[PDB]
Amino acid sequence: KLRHLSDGYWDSAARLGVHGAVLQAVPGGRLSAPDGRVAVNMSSYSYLGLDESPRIIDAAIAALRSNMVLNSSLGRVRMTLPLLEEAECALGDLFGADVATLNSCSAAAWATLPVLASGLLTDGVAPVMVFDKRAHFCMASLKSLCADETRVETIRHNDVDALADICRKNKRVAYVCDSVYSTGGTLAPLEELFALQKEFGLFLYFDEAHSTSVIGDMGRGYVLDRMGAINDSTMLITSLNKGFGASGGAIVFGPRDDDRKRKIIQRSSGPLMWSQRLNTPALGAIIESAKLHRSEALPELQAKLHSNIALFDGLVRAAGQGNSVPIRYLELGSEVDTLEASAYLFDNGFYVEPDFFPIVSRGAAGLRARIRSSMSTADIEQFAHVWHKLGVD
């Protein structure tokens, strides 16, 4: 019955044109409506502006012109195009690990979490799957698929002490979490988790979707940066279209010289086997973005991002102020107030996506902003002016 008012907001969101509408991509991180209104996108997941990189777009087209086919042997043969190998080898040199590409980070979780619960990745010993409470939904929805294979226990957020207790009462334990948490700005306790891993052999499973391109040298990620080189007990899934400037997702199996984890997941029954690989333009974009991630352009993009983050925090008060995570939340009074503010900001040249029930709790709606390197200093200052004029009048 609670759906009575939940979907009631969705219809109010689609009516005002600030949710479920149609806008065109315009250079400069800008969206254009059919009527001619141009606004600056303040919620784009492309944290480095690589979705507008002319190098990446040309490489996607160049790969499609060369191979003259969309399928890289997806939904087809167990063979593979050289493009797909060059793509997974590019991600391999970038991350320093054995990497496989999939059509989405969600497909990576579907292909890894169950077989991880089977012990095939932990020397036949079925581990105890420990999920964080704030783990992403593409992983937590598969808890039952994991439960049919071993014991599943959900602990509260960053409860390192409760996790260590299960590591003492069981021989093999695994922890599934996010490297970077969007809602809350919290981070995975790497120092505490690497201590448990060095003692009990705790298996680590990180979702690096909000961590891949924005954190670490060469944009290797929060986990891979503070760790140095991945081991045989750490596994990463990530999305390659949120800051990486490409498409699909990837499984970061482990050590580059070790083919055992890739073989075990390949020959298992999962999306890595039956589902379709990425199309040629995505693979070409992955290659070019991997080369771009290894050049001096990426640390320059990270600097402009941190620069834009500091500018935003000094001009606008938002939940998450002071983070290194470029996600800010302008918590508004109600869902109706959330929708009307977005409509006002758009007519003055700024789109900010609205969150509400049931995505967020009742009475806790607001506008979800995301900071990217491609935003200019004038864009952020002008947004803070429009945001301040709304509050007063």
Ligand X SMILES: *Cc1c(COP(=O)(O)O)cnc(C)c1O
Q: Which does 182 bind (CB under 5 to 8 A by kind): ligand X, a copy of itself, none?
A: ligand X
- Count of positions on this chain that bind ligand X (CB under 6 A): 17
CB of 318 to ligand X, least distance (A): 18
Q: Which of 52, 207, 335, 379 binds ligand X (CB under 6 A)?
A: 207
Binding status of residue 210 toward ligand X by CB under 6 A: yes
Structure tokens at 94: 């970038």
Buried b (16+ CB within 10 A) or exposed e, 30-62: bbeeeeeeebbbbbbbbbbbbbbbebbbebbeb
Is 134 annotated to bind ligand?
A: no
What is the 3-state secondary structure of 295-328?
Answer: CCHHHHHHHHHHHHHHHHHHHCCCECCCCCCCEE
Is 362 annotated to bind ligand?
A: no
CB of 109 to ligand X, least distance (A): 8
CB 270 within 8 Å of CB 64: no
Binding status of residue 67 toward a copy of itself by CB under 8 A: yes
Determine the length of the chain.
393
In terms of CB distance, is 230 or 350 closer to a copy of itself? 350
Binding status of residue 40 toward a copy of itself by CB under 8 A: no
Binding status of residue 10 toward a copy of itself by CB under 8 A: yes
- Tokens 């391999």 belong to 92
In terms of CB distance, is 304 or 370 closer to ligand X? 370
Structure tokens at 120: 């095939």
Binding status of residue 46 toward ligand X by CB under 6 A: no
Binding status of residue 290 toward ligand X by CB under 6 A: no
For residue 308, what are the CA distances in angstroms to 295, 311, 329, 330?
A: 21, 5, 16, 17
Q: Which does 344 bind (CB under 5 to 8 A by kind): a copy of itself, ligand X, none?
A: none
Residues that bind ligand X (CB under 6 A): 75, 104-106, 136, 138, 178, 182, 207, 209-210, 239, 242, 249, 274-276
